[PDB]
C-alpha cells in the first residue's frame, strides 16, 4: 500500500534470483537486490531495473544466503523465503517505472562473519 499515487497493481508475488545480486519478477523484469542492516534486522532493498537475462548459477547467493534463492509474497505485506524465514515489507513502491521494494528479514541469529 506504500505505492501511493504511482501504483503498481501488485508487488512481485515471487522474486527468483537469476543473476549476481539480481532477482527476476513474475512480470519477467529484473530486480537488483542490495542490503543494509538495522538494530535487529537485515534489510534487502530490491530495485527493479532492466539488465540482460543470463542465468549466473548463483555462487554468490548460496555463499551469502542472507538474501534467498526465492522470495514468496506473504500476508500482512511480508515475503517468505525458500529458506523458511520471513522478510517484512518496509515498502513496495515505484518511481518513473523503477519499482523499489524494502524487504526486512525478521530477527535472525546474526553471527559474526557469516549468518
UniProtKB/Swiss-Prot annotation:
Keyword Protein biosynthesis: no
Disulfide-linked positions: none
Domain of life: Eukaryota
Gene Ontology BP, a term: intracellular signal transduction
Keywords for this protein: Chromosomal rearrangement, Proto-oncogene
Distribution of this protein across tissues and organs: Not found at a significant level in any tissue.
GO molecular function: protein kinase binding; protein serine/threonine kinase activator activity
Cleaved signal peptide residues: none
Gene3D superfamilies, sorted: TCL1/MTCP1
Alphabetical list of InterPro entries matching this protein: TCL1_MTCP1 (IPR004832), TCL1_MTCP1_sf (IPR036672)
Keyword flag Cytoplasm: no
Family label: Belongs to the TCL1 family.
Protein name, per record: Protein p13 MTCP-1
Organism expressing this protein natively: Homo sapiens (Human)
Amino acid at each position: 500500500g506504500s505505492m501511493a499515487g504511482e501504483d503498481v497493481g501488485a508487488p512481485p508475488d515471487h522474486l527468483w534470483v537469476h543473476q549476481e545480486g539480481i532477482y527476476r519478477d513474475e512480470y519477467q523484469r529484473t530486480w537488483v537486490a542490495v542490503v543494509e542492516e538495522e538494530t535487529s534486522f537485515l534489510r534487502a532493498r530490491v530495485q527493479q531495473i532492466q539488465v540482460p537475462l543470463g542465468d549466473a548459477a548463483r555462487p554468490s547467493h548460496l555463499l551469502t544466503s542472507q538474501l534467498p534463492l526465492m522470495w514468496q509474497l506473504y500476508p500482512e505485506e511480508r515475503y517468505m523465503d525458500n529458506n523458511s524465514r520471513l522478510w517484512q515489507i518496509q515498502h513496495h513502491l515505484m518511481v518513473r517505472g523503477v519499482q523499489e521494494l524494502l524487504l526486512k528479514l525478521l530477527p535472525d541469529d546474526r553471527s559474526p562473519g557469516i549468518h
